[PDB]
Amino acid sequence: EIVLTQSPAITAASLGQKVTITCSASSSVSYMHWYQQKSGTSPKPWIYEISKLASGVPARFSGSGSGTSYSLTISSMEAEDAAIYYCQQWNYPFTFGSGTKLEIKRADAAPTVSIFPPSSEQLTSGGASVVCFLNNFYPKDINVKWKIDGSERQNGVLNSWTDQDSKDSTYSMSSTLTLTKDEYERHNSYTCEATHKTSTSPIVKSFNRN
Amino acid sequence: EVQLQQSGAELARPGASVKMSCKASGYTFTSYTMHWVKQRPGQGLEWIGYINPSSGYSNYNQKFKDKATLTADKSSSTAYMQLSSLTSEDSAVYYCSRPVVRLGYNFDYWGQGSTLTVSSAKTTPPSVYPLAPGSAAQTNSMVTLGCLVKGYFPEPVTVTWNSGSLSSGVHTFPAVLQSDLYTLSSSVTVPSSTWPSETVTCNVAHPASSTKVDKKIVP
């Protein structure tokens, strides 16, 4: 069995910097292909047979290597270059590498937190979801904590994260506390707390039901 | 003009079978093989096998033998892939690709992919709730609104704001599964001078249940 491991697994490159990613084969392979995949779309052939650029590929990309090690290099990083790159064995069973997520490095940014009480219509239907958005922050690492009447609530919240924003290169996160109208009315204080590396102080947003 | 049009999203029960298609055009169908690739939610790609339309011959990745069955119809220039004895491990996006042979196969053309969901859950429309501020984000020059698209199945749903007129400050989050039902949210951030002064509506569509929702965000 031949296994293709790529490195780095993830890295944030600044615009204009040279970027080099690698693909290591468990055993020697004659040729290697590369692909570029952007969120929610089919992989696009990027490089064929170690060094031939595919259609639609900028000259700033180049491929090289042999045996058990191959590399894809971007002479100068450009915004549109942010994506996930996969290498692939040139022959049966056409094994794909583990992938490399290339992101854009930008200045640190604290999250803008917004909390939302349940809507009138959800309440009327007997439900009560409290929503919190932690938007446009950087780097990606972040943690959210919920407090009901001052008590931290664990396990019972749906969290989701977006990929880097195609426009300002930031990240965003959504956290939802789902309760019944009854549970919601049981208490009065709801708090969403975001902790990012930009501050030792959590960014807190809260509201009182009454 | 090489184009590969794949069939739509599929929902199948465990133990059942499904057959996806890939309609080719823009080239001589029988002159090139057609390969299929699998990509599970949140991870890497896996090659399944190929069919050679000129002879009907097929070769498979050992892992997919007796799992996938690849056929082709010369008259309709369409490649097919049947998957049997479905399990949750079969849920993924499947692509077809037509490679050209040079020093080796060069997979220069790909279909848009077909998403397969293996589950016993039934189709359910989403409930869309408006997410309006509670007088506190005013301190911010920018106001953030949103829509909670709750309890639907299966994927996917599409979300636009003001029918596409608002796209810049939009963040639509990946759906998450809760108790076998999907929930996702979408937020839009606009200048406080834009709303409530002007109308902001989220347009949510859920093809599986032929649902269309235009939820206006009222204070």
XYZ file of C-alpha atoms in Angstrom:
429
model
C 0.000 0.000 0.000
C 1.312 3.429 -0.962
C 0.319 6.330 1.273
C 0.728 9.988 0.319
C 1.252 12.405 3.207
C 1.233 16.147 2.526
C 2.772 18.970 4.544
C 2.057 21.417 5.879
C -1.435 20.226 6.796
C -2.383 23.895 7.103
C -0.475 27.189 6.785
C -1.245 30.910 6.469
C 0.812 32.676 3.812
C 1.035 36.450 3.438
C 0.313 37.929 0.016
C 3.530 38.072 -1.991
C 5.366 35.346 -0.065
C 6.772 32.233 -1.707
C 4.840 29.116 -0.730
C 6.035 25.532 -0.973
C 3.932 22.503 -0.109
C 5.035 18.897 -0.236
C 3.753 15.401 -0.847
C 5.640 12.379 0.465
C 5.005 8.901 -0.920
C 5.423 5.879 1.363
C 7.396 4.321 -1.490
C 8.751 5.648 -4.799
C 6.292 6.754 -7.489
C 7.152 7.781 -11.073
C 4.889 10.819 -11.415
C 2.613 12.933 -9.260
C -0.352 15.180 -10.082
C -1.774 18.080 -8.073
C -5.287 19.468 -7.633
C -6.822 22.593 -6.156
C -10.189 22.474 -4.432
C -12.194 25.393 -3.131
C -15.093 24.999 -0.706
C -18.132 23.292 -2.199
C -16.692 22.730 -5.674
C -15.160 19.840 -7.614
C -11.387 19.411 -7.461
C -9.652 21.180 -10.334
C -6.620 19.611 -12.004
C -3.689 21.914 -11.250
C -0.501 20.110 -12.262
C 0.030 16.957 -14.315
C 2.991 14.610 -14.332
C 5.054 16.456 -11.728
C 5.499 19.774 -13.574
C 2.979 20.461 -16.362
C 0.460 23.180 -15.517
C -3.191 22.411 -16.188
C -5.551 24.756 -17.999
C -6.428 27.841 -15.964
C -3.292 27.686 -13.827
C -1.151 30.851 -13.288
C 2.561 30.767 -14.139
C 3.424 31.534 -10.507
C 2.778 27.846 -9.783
C 5.394 25.196 -10.490
C 5.729 21.513 -9.689
C 8.824 19.433 -9.093
C 10.212 16.358 -7.396
C 10.818 12.657 -7.979
C 10.721 9.303 -6.213
C 9.170 9.729 -2.776
C 9.032 13.515 -2.625
C 7.243 16.127 -4.718
C 6.507 19.814 -4.263
C 4.163 22.520 -5.519
C 5.512 26.053 -5.268
C 3.863 29.448 -5.633
C 6.515 32.057 -6.423
C 4.320 34.786 -4.935
C 1.101 34.168 -2.969
C -2.066 35.813 -4.284
C -5.493 35.904 -2.606
C -7.086 33.571 -5.168
C -4.449 30.976 -4.267
C -6.109 30.201 -0.931
C -7.560 26.693 -1.164
C -6.920 23.042 -0.374
C -4.325 21.263 -2.497
C -4.134 17.526 -3.066
C -1.436 15.463 -4.717
C -2.257 12.206 -6.447
C -0.434 9.044 -7.523
C -0.223 8.993 -11.340
C -1.333 5.351 -11.667
C -3.617 2.707 -10.095
C -5.088 2.920 -7.518
C -4.704 6.676 -8.066
C -4.315 7.375 -4.345
C -4.840 10.985 -3.207
C -2.705 12.767 -0.636
C -3.968 13.984 2.741
C -4.270 17.560 1.495
C -2.823 20.959 2.425
C -5.032 23.887 3.426
C -3.401 27.113 2.282
C -4.885 30.186 3.930
C -4.161 33.923 3.865
C -2.209 35.489 6.714
C -3.648 38.794 7.909
C -3.570 41.000 11.015
C -5.166 39.742 14.248
C -8.772 40.844 14.724
C -11.040 40.450 17.737
C -14.485 38.930 17.180
C -17.551 41.155 16.913
C -20.135 39.391 19.064
C -23.897 39.587 18.503
C -26.507 37.804 20.627
C -30.072 37.138 19.514
C -33.070 36.378 21.734
C -35.588 33.844 20.375
C -37.918 35.262 17.718
C -41.591 35.929 18.448
C -42.594 33.324 15.883
C -40.377 30.605 17.312
C -41.709 31.334 20.801
C -45.270 31.219 19.505
C -44.457 27.748 18.135
C -43.223 26.706 21.575
C -39.494 26.877 20.884
C -36.622 29.078 22.014
C -33.257 29.208 20.255
C -30.721 31.802 21.413
C -28.167 32.640 18.735
C -24.722 34.121 18.942
C -22.447 35.140 16.083
C -18.711 35.647 16.610
C -17.813 37.365 13.366
C -14.748 38.495 11.445
C -11.954 37.488 13.799
C -8.419 36.223 13.156
C -6.659 33.861 13.791
C -9.238 31.060 13.507
C -8.912 29.596 17.020
C -11.776 30.607 19.287
C -13.964 29.389 22.123
C -17.535 30.179 23.091
C -19.172 29.838 26.493
C -22.820 30.188 27.464
C -24.159 31.230 30.858
C -27.804 31.024 31.895
C -28.512 33.041 35.047
C -24.751 33.136 35.535
C -24.209 29.369 35.244
C -22.042 27.983 32.445
C -23.967 25.515 30.286
C -22.023 22.601 28.789
C -23.073 20.210 26.013
C -26.312 21.489 24.514
C -25.125 24.046 21.988
C -24.681 23.760 18.214
C -21.466 25.342 16.923
C -20.479 25.956 13.312
C -17.521 27.678 11.675
C -17.022 29.304 8.280
C -13.913 29.023 6.163
C -11.736 32.079 5.629
C -13.713 34.996 4.200
C -12.982 35.537 0.502
C -13.099 39.286 1.180
C -11.380 40.246 4.448
C -9.720 36.890 5.161
C -11.313 36.634 8.614
C -13.216 33.759 10.248
C -16.665 33.625 11.809
C -18.482 31.255 14.155
C -22.127 30.675 15.054
C -23.257 29.208 18.378
C -26.847 28.219 19.060
C -28.439 27.371 22.392
C -31.657 25.466 21.722
C -34.296 25.403 24.439
C -38.051 25.002 24.779
C -40.198 28.076 25.411
C -40.590 26.675 28.928
C -36.871 26.233 29.551
C -36.228 29.716 28.191
C -38.850 31.304 30.463
C -37.447 29.358 33.419
C -34.504 31.779 33.562
C -33.913 35.449 32.752
C -30.219 36.017 31.967
C -28.535 34.738 28.799
C -24.898 35.364 28.017
C -22.585 34.502 25.131
C -18.869 34.802 25.891
C -16.151 34.643 23.252
C -12.496 34.168 24.097
C -9.964 34.863 21.366
C -6.192 35.290 21.589
C -6.679 39.025 20.979
C -7.630 39.425 24.648
C -7.467 37.702 28.020
C -10.876 39.283 28.593
C -13.802 37.427 27.012
C -16.057 39.524 24.784
C -19.446 39.252 26.454
C -22.902 39.870 25.026
C -26.025 39.357 27.119
C -29.715 40.114 27.354
C -32.463 39.675 29.914
C -35.653 37.924 28.816
C -37.714 40.333 30.907
C -16.623 22.291 -24.774
C -16.027 19.121 -22.758
C -18.776 18.962 -20.132
C -19.789 16.381 -17.539
C -23.277 16.806 -16.085
C -23.987 14.641 -13.044
C -27.364 13.727 -11.528
C -28.771 15.526 -8.477
C -28.537 14.922 -4.729
C -29.681 11.498 -3.564
C -31.238 10.297 -0.321
C -31.226 6.522 0.162
C -32.049 4.136 2.987
C -29.420 1.891 4.572
C -29.251 -1.435 2.745
C -30.708 0.052 -0.423
C -28.973 0.755 -3.713
C -28.652 3.899 -5.811
C -27.529 4.733 -9.339
C -25.946 8.075 -10.200
C -25.269 9.344 -13.699
C -22.734 11.450 -15.554
C -23.774 12.771 -18.946
C -20.873 13.689 -21.208
C -20.824 16.045 -24.176
C -18.303 17.976 -26.247
C -16.134 14.997 -27.204
C -16.308 11.428 -28.524
C -17.667 9.538 -25.508
C -16.314 6.112 -26.490
C -12.779 7.457 -27.005
C -12.097 8.121 -23.313
C -12.513 6.270 -20.039
C -14.738 7.714 -17.312
C -13.518 7.534 -13.720
C -15.404 8.064 -10.471
C -14.146 9.595 -7.225
C -15.524 9.643 -3.683
C -15.146 12.397 -1.105
C -16.587 11.888 2.363
C -17.861 14.899 4.331
C -14.924 16.833 5.720
C -12.062 14.865 4.210
C -9.948 13.415 1.423
C -10.622 11.929 -1.978
C -10.747 8.267 -3.005
C -10.602 6.815 -6.511
C -13.322 4.197 -7.139
C -12.645 2.847 -10.618
C -13.211 3.390 -14.321
C -15.342 2.253 -17.229
C -14.132 2.227 -20.823
C -17.247 3.022 -22.936
C -15.666 1.564 -26.082
C -15.704 -1.980 -24.708
C -17.736 -1.897 -21.516
C -14.670 -2.991 -19.561
C -14.315 -1.753 -15.990
C -11.574 -1.887 -13.346
C -12.089 -1.086 -9.663
C -10.161 -0.021 -6.614
C -10.106 -3.246 -4.569
C -11.973 -1.431 -1.785
C -14.986 -0.762 -4.021
C -15.341 -4.114 -5.796
C -18.894 -5.401 -5.293
C -19.772 -2.009 -3.812
C -19.743 0.102 -6.951
C -20.836 -1.096 -10.387
C -19.782 1.054 -13.345
C -21.618 0.987 -16.671
C -21.955 3.206 -19.736
C -24.570 3.889 -22.400
C -23.029 4.804 -25.766
C -26.309 6.045 -27.248
C -26.841 8.607 -24.473
C -23.142 9.265 -23.840
C -23.760 8.664 -20.140
C -21.689 6.875 -17.516
C -23.430 5.275 -14.537
C -22.367 4.204 -11.082
C -24.493 1.936 -8.937
C -23.740 1.569 -5.225
C -25.260 -1.384 -3.361
C -25.808 -2.408 0.274
C -25.584 1.228 1.342
C -24.241 2.158 4.781
C -23.527 5.501 6.439
C -19.919 5.170 5.233
C -21.310 5.603 1.713
C -22.584 9.110 2.413
C -20.343 11.425 0.412
C -19.937 13.478 -2.729
C -19.228 11.445 -5.868
C -17.573 12.862 -8.984
C -17.026 11.536 -12.472
C -13.943 12.592 -14.405
C -12.861 11.954 -17.988
C -9.075 11.726 -18.257
C -6.847 12.020 -21.309
C -3.841 9.731 -21.618
C -0.407 11.312 -21.914
C 2.533 10.097 -19.838
C -0.269 8.805 -17.654
C -3.938 9.576 -17.060
C -4.517 13.331 -16.823
C -7.921 14.013 -15.255
C -8.612 17.277 -17.040
C -12.409 17.325 -16.808
C -14.698 16.789 -13.834
C -18.424 16.712 -13.218
C -19.940 18.981 -10.575
C -20.479 16.059 -8.199
C -23.531 14.275 -6.765
C -24.160 14.188 -3.015
C -25.376 10.944 -1.482
C -27.041 10.840 1.933
C -27.613 7.366 3.401
C -30.169 7.662 6.183
C -33.513 6.385 7.428
C -34.699 9.929 8.199
C -37.505 11.467 6.158
C -37.507 14.732 4.241
C -38.540 17.681 6.413
C -38.808 21.382 5.462
C -36.871 23.957 7.509
C -38.423 26.472 9.886
C -36.842 29.847 9.179
C -36.669 32.327 12.042
C -35.655 36.001 11.835
C -32.680 37.052 13.945
C -33.135 40.721 14.810
C -31.063 42.673 17.364
C -32.387 43.438 20.826
C -31.164 47.024 21.109
C -27.491 46.664 22.037
C -25.564 46.319 18.781
C -26.534 49.927 18.079
C -23.266 51.006 19.701
C -21.693 49.421 16.625
C -21.628 51.430 13.394
C -22.560 48.129 11.751
C -25.666 46.086 12.544
C -25.724 42.300 12.252
C -28.895 40.461 11.291
C -29.500 36.797 10.630
C -31.811 33.901 9.890
C -31.936 30.555 11.686
C -32.762 27.730 9.266
C -33.833 25.016 11.667
C -34.729 21.344 11.561
C -34.560 20.343 7.904
C -33.521 17.187 6.075
C -31.730 16.342 3.938
C -29.098 18.803 2.737
C -28.792 21.219 1.154
C -30.469 24.602 1.486
C -29.465 27.793 -0.272
C -29.518 31.190 1.387
C -29.305 34.616 -0.226
C -30.089 38.047 1.197
C -32.335 40.485 -0.652
C -32.287 38.032 -3.556
C -28.552 38.499 -4.002
C -28.438 42.281 -3.616
C -26.624 41.809 -0.306
C -23.655 39.453 -0.474
C -20.573 41.245 0.873
C -21.200 41.185 4.615
C -22.763 37.714 4.527
C -21.653 34.629 6.489
C -23.617 31.453 5.855
C -22.480 28.702 8.210
C -22.162 24.960 7.459
C -25.243 23.071 8.620
C -24.858 20.904 11.715
C -26.818 17.756 12.487
C -28.873 17.701 15.694
C -31.094 14.716 16.451
C -30.981 13.722 12.799
C -32.120 17.154 11.617
C -29.991 19.905 10.091
C -29.758 23.429 11.430
C -27.752 26.272 9.989
C -27.628 30.010 10.303
C -26.716 32.912 8.083
C -25.780 36.395 9.198
C -25.515 39.627 7.263
C -23.836 42.778 8.527
C -24.900 46.126 7.115
C -24.455 49.765 8.182
C -26.932 50.810 10.874
C -28.086 53.378 8.319
C -29.282 50.571 6.030
C -31.640 48.726 8.394
C -34.424 49.073 9.551
C -34.512 52.011 7.122
C -34.498 49.537 4.218
C -35.914 46.017 3.919
C -33.598 43.076 4.583
C -34.906 39.605 3.793
C -33.257 36.207 3.765
C -34.244 33.976 0.866
C -34.055 30.326 1.874
C -34.672 27.422 -0.483
C -34.828 23.711 0.376
C -35.117 21.761 -2.927
C -35.777 18.389 -1.263
C -39.103 19.677 0.101
C -39.755 22.194 -2.677
C -39.692 24.915 -0.033
C -39.123 28.608 -0.702
C -38.917 31.107 2.154
C -38.511 34.884 2.030
C -38.204 35.961 5.657
C -38.185 39.724 6.182
C -36.155 40.933 9.159
C -38.438 43.263 11.106
C -37.401 45.005 14.358
